[model samples]
Target: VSKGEELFTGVVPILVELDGDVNGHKFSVSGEGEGDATYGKLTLKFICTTGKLPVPWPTLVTTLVLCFSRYPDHMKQHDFFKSAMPEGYVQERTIFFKDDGNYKTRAEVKFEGDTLVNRIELKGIDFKEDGNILGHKLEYNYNSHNVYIMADKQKNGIKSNFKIRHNIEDGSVQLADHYQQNTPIGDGPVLLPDNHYLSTQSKLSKDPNEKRDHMVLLEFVTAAGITL
Candidate 1:
């Protein structure tokens, strides 16, 4: 392995070194401030050699890990998190892998909650012989982000029986009729849960009826998948 150059600064950088190959890799580093308040850091870089590729292999399978930190006080009162994920708190969002190669793509998102966190995993596999996706799976995990919620498969462009949990408290939602194709593309009209139209004023419509017509045209072209 080869190491890169280091630039000096008033503040120190953090440096970590590791050994071994892709499957089994290891490394460690640690440091703290001095004089009970002083801090120091170090930095380092390494490069590896690329060997032969795998058979029926991924032209590329990119994996990324990210971490975000939030104080306990701030997370408790956040409305979005409370509404979207009430069971647990979102300490951080970690995305492990996002691969798009060989007609296969997989991505994952992790949400850390208070009582118990969860993960959303998506995997898509393309059938080379057919023009449609051969298999697709959307999994969920209670604690471990790497675990799978469930698996799904397709046969002759038809999907099999699969169940998915959408709500936090109730996990009885079925996949077949629960989800519908709301829109084909682009942004659309804003509809409330009561099925009432949202009020809006546009430059094109100076009157109420004209504004409603403008909104209808906008909704038809933008949200309803119709190109004007």
Candidate 2:
């Protein structure tokens, strides 16, 4: 508690720990980060213990979830850890990916889903509309964060694969030639194979015997089959 003058300030390196159930999914979040008013040193680590998570190569959302949450302030940011999360996090906007080619090792794959094994692969991707090469023939507007199959360039979605709508009806993914479909996330959407929506509510925690107000609690809930 450093309080002098000059607008006053100090550093209190805080650490937040969150542990709870997210739609039947077990999660624990812990991290270290510090901040003061507008400056801070960020750090975090989140682990998903239940349900299915990709290994060898996690999804983009997985990466983000493991490291997100921040609030910097108080004169001198003393490094803090405000790590926590919700279950309905990623949604279908997420996909599993692992490099498997070039000339060897990683073979070019389109879209493959083996629900039996609860694994999905998305190879031969063209995330950046103008970024495509040899065997990889898929394209989309990254700003939208969506995917689709574009096999032909002069089909109905001509204009250089601008409207190729290959929406995967069921739980599947594919790669045609050069077309991409687009869709925005919806209100309360299904983000897991078990079908659940993500939600979060915040609460504060304080140790009666201690002098620091450093405990934070985050409660969560999800939809059907997920223990709504």
Task: Output the number of the lDDT-best candidate.
Answer: 2
Q: Give the alpha-carbon lDDT of every model.
A: 0.17, 0.22
Question: Model 2 lDDT vs. the true structure?
Answer: 0.22
Model 1, runs deviating above 4 Å: 1-79, 82-85, 88-99, 102-114, 126-228
lDDT per residue as tens, model 2, 35-71: 2322212222233333232211111112121111222
| Residue range 1-228, candidate 1, lDDT tens digits | 001001111222221121212112121111111110011111122122222211111111111111111112322221111222222222211211122212112222122221112221222232222211111122122110111111111110111121222112234321211111111011211111111111111111122433211111100100111111
lDDT of 1: 0.17
